[PDB]
Design an enzyme around this catalytic site. Structure first.
Site, mmCIF file in Angstrom:
data_model
loop_
_atom_site.group_PDB
_atom_site.id
_atom_site.type_symbol
_atom_site.label_atom_id
_atom_site.label_comp_id
_atom_site.label_asym_id
_atom_site.label_seq_id
_atom_site.Cartn_x
_atom_site.Cartn_y
_atom_site.Cartn_z
ATOM 1 N N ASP A 1 -11.486 5.977 6.895
ATOM 2 C CA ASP A 1 -11.238 6.314 5.462
ATOM 3 C C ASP A 1 -12.431 5.886 4.596
ATOM 4 O O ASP A 1 -12.304 4.868 3.871
ATOM 5 C CB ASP A 1 -9.895 5.749 4.992
ATOM 6 N N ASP B 1 -13.192 -0.159 0.705
ATOM 7 C CA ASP B 1 -11.739 0.064 0.916
ATOM 8 C C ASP B 1 -11.317 -0.413 2.316
ATOM 9 O O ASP B 1 -10.368 0.164 2.879
ATOM 10 C CB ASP B 1 -11.385 1.532 0.671
ATOM 11 N N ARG C 1 -4.740 -0.681 6.587
ATOM 12 C CA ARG C 1 -4.321 0.764 6.566
ATOM 13 C C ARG C 1 -5.483 1.615 7.080
ATOM 14 O O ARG C 1 -5.207 2.627 7.755
ATOM 15 C CB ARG C 1 -3.846 1.287 5.202
ATOM 16 N N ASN C 2 -6.720 1.151 6.853
ATOM 17 C CA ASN C 2 -7.985 1.900 7.110
ATOM 18 C C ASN C 2 -8.648 1.427 8.415
ATOM 19 O O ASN C 2 -9.838 1.738 8.629
ATOM 20 C CB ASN C 2 -8.909 1.821 5.885
#
Ligand SMILES: */C=C/C(=O)Nc1cc(-c2cn(C)c3ccccc23)ncn1
Length: 301
Positions: free
Chosen positions: A156, A138, A142-143
């Site tokens: 994350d 992932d 965003r992470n």
């Protein structure tokens, strides 16, 4: 057969930390005073939603497992857990939020030197995870979280697995970041992580654009089979873009290795203005008494 994982899981009393305000919906900004020590540590406190849910508790604890088992300057470590009504994860506070939000909100104040240094830092962090036989599954802008504009870390681990490949079985998945072998055959390796790294670099070089914006995720594996990729971002020399394009090769073993992505971005960070062309690049800058950043709070290993 494999090395024993002697990572410490630290159990913290609810009295060792104050939740100071909310950051999301829940993650709180907080302060942690380890008992019997004259330090205060800025922390993020992630507290399970329902807590009624037994499925939910398996989730957060798997994340805690992985976060406890990493120690690298470009990866978020776990400081401890607190076993209350709702299980809470305690982690280092990353004051400047996600790098995705940071590029969107500062798109006019970010220079080539920062963008290329981030590309190196994320590469270093992913190389460490590969070293520790860990697939993130992932990686996305965003992470990546911002400790300072000069310092980002991968975060994350909600989906991270240890190993080999990893045949998963459906779920809510991030299609637009995923390798083709991941979308078709739910196969994941370090090289599927490299593909998402490609998409992550694209996100940063377009100052946080949405990849394949307004293409439905049902279309994506077809487009990628046909040989289409994300376009060259305006600021990107062919040099930089050619690197992202190598990360998106159909043959996973023809994709670059994180260790090489470190090397290539590092050369380019020695001469940033040759590799990224940005309007006005030249001219751009980016009791508390016992407070100590988590990165300076060490315990015996
Ligand atoms: C270095 C560990 C770390 O994750 N620090 C951290 C994390 C956040 C964060 C994570 N998530 C999923 C959030 C949602 C909303 C707001 C903040 C979130 N924030 C600060 N530090």
């Amino acid at each position: 057969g494999e090395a024993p994982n002697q990572a410490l899981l630290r159990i913290l009393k609810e009295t060792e930390f104050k939740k100071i305000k909310v950051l999301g919906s829940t993650v709180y900004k907080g302060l942690w005073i380890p008992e019997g020590e004259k330090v205060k540590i800025p922390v993020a406190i992630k507290e399970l939603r329902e807590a009624t849910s037994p499925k939910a508790n398996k989730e957060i604890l798997d994340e805690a497992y992985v976060m406890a088992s990493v120690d690298n300057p470009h990866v978020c470590r776990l400081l401890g857990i607190c076993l209350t009504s709702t299980v809470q994860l305690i982690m280092q506070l990353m004051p400047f939020g996600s790098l995705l939000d940071y590029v969107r909100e500062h798109k006019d104040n970010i220079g080539s030197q920062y963008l290329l240094n981030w590309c190196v830092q994320i590469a270093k962090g992913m190389n460490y995870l590969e070293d520790r036989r860990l697939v993130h599954r992932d990686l996305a802008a965003r992470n990546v979280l911002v400790k300072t504009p000069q310092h980002v870390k991968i975060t994350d681990f909600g989906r991270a697995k240890l190993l080999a490949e990893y045949h998963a079985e459906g779920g809510k998945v991030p299609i637009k970041w995923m390798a083709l072998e991941s979308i078709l055959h739910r196969i994941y390796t370090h090289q599927s992580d490299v593909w998402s790294y490609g998409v992550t670099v694209w996100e940063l070089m377009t100052f946080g654009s949405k990849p394949y914006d307004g293409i439905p995720a049902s279309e994506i594996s077809s487009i990628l089979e046909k040989g289409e990729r994300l376009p060259q971002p305006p600021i990107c020399t062919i040099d930089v873009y050619m690197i992202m394009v190598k990360c998106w090769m159909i043959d996973a073993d023809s994709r670059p290795k994180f260790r090489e992505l470190i090397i290539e971005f590092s050369k380019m960070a020695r001469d940033p203005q040759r590799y990224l062309v940005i309007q006005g690049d030249e001219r751009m800058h980016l009791d508390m008494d016992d407070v100590v950043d988590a990165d300076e709070y060490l315990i015996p290993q």
